[PDB]
């Protein structure tokens, strides 16, 4: 039997285009009474093998059991769809990146920033209980969405597929030094993800894009080969400094697990 036929591409209402980039395009749309985004993956040298892989990789993103994980609602198989396509619920505030760096109406306060950190840590702790890990899931501020009640949610629609831009990294500033250089199979993936969270902490503290003045190639090559790191921000609380420093330990084995830092972040909220 064929378990899942996926979502009918013909049923999607494409309203307005939000982006076109190296992956394909992103639209705001509607489907069966849902406000959604539609991610259209435009893949060179599409093949039956890659289409098979898309349909096996997509179900793992359909995670409906944790408030800080944003599931892929479903996917359109290609064929019969024009391109491999995935849909997710529309998050009114966009990405964490948008909220922190492109917010024209308000600046989120630091209590909200701490809550974002807790939300992300809870979602990553849950994802780290999956066996095996979801492959090619990178944590960065573009791959977390902010829902209508300001809940931060890990974006499963931003997990790269096996065929999607292999050999390229468009957000290296969040990637652990070892993960810039070694195959994922030769890295502790959970520890590499904690480095990404440490960079998120830095981002929430500075309200700056990490290494904003450098190109992605410069970032990856200098972090991997020249010991380039974000500078600890000056005059923040010792408690935040110590947390940032241990999550960004040069030794992957010494970085904490997400379920270890969730109680620290809980105690950092307001009584």
């Amino acid at each position: 039997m064929n378990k899942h036929s996926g979502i009918d591409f013909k049923q999607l209402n494409f309203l307005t285009k939000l982006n076109e980039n190296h992956s394909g395009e992103l639209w705001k749309g509607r489907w069966q009474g849902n406000d959604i985004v539609v991610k259209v993956l435009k893949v060179a040298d599409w093949s039956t093998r890659k289409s098979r892989d898309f349909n096996e990789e997509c179900p793992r993103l359909r995670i409906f059991s944790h408030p800080n994980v944003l599931p892929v609602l479903g996917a359109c198989q290609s064929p019969p769809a024009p391109h491999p396509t995935l849909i997710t619920h529309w998050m009114p505030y966009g990405s964490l990146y948008n909220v922190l760096h492109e917010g024209t109406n308000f600046v989120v306060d630091q209590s909200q920033a701490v809550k974002f950190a807790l939300d992300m840590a809870r979602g990553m702790a849950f994802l780290h209980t999956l066996e095996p890990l979801i492959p090619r899931h990178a944590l960065n501020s573009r791959s977390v969405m902010i829902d209508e009640d300001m809940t931060a949610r890990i974006s499963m629609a931003d997990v790269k597929f096996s065929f999607q831009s292999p050999g390229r990294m468009y957000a290296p500033a969040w990637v652990a030094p070892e993960a810039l250089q070694k195959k994922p199979e030769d890295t502790n993936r959970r520890s590499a993800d904690m480095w990404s969270f440490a960079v998120l902490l830095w981002e929430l503290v500075t309200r700056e894009v990490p290494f904003a003045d450098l190109s992605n190639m410069e970032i990856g090559m200098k972090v991997a080969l020249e010991g380039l790191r974000p500078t600890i921000p000056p005059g923040i609380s010792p408690h935040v400094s110590k947390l940032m420093k241990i999550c960004m330990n040069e030794d992957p084995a010494k970085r904490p697990k997400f379920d270890m830092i969730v109680p620290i972040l809980e105690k950092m909220q307001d009584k």
Partner: protein
């Protein structure tokens, strides 16, 4: 087009060469790497891959290509990968074979770089 520029214009050819020496050094110097000879330092494919990332806005994970190729086969793979990235950037499939770059066919080394310069002129 480019055949006439190589074969039947030595004065113009050297105006384009110095250009390409400035062009690739403009970008690779950001990685503390210098290009002093257009005809032999792109042959192993490494600087072509690094250049493509600098020009199209991505990092290439080091496990995705051979940073220090140890064989003719590895350089050919690097160059082929760089040509794939060129095609991902909108260029049509380059006319030289990847082995021609690894064998320093200057008309091929210059043609690849010429099409890179032409396309990525305004890039900083």
């Amino acid at each position: 087009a480019f055949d006439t520029l190589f074969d039947h214009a030595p004065d113009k050819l050297n105006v384009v060469k110095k250009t390409l020496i400035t062009f690739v050094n403009k970008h690779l110097n950001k990685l503390n790497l210098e290009v002093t000879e257009l005809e032999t330092q792109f042959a192993d494919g490494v600087y072509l891959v690094l250049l493509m990332g600098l020009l199209e806005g991505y990092f290439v994970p080091l496990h995705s290509f051979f940073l220090t190729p140890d064989s003719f086969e590895q350089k050919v793979l690097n160059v082929s990968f760089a040509f794939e990235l060129m095609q991902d950037g909108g260029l049509e499939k380059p006319k030289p074979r990847p082995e021609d770059i690894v064998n320093c066919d200057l008309k091929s080394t210059l043609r690849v770089l010429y099409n890179l310069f032409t396309k990525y002129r305004n890039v900083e």
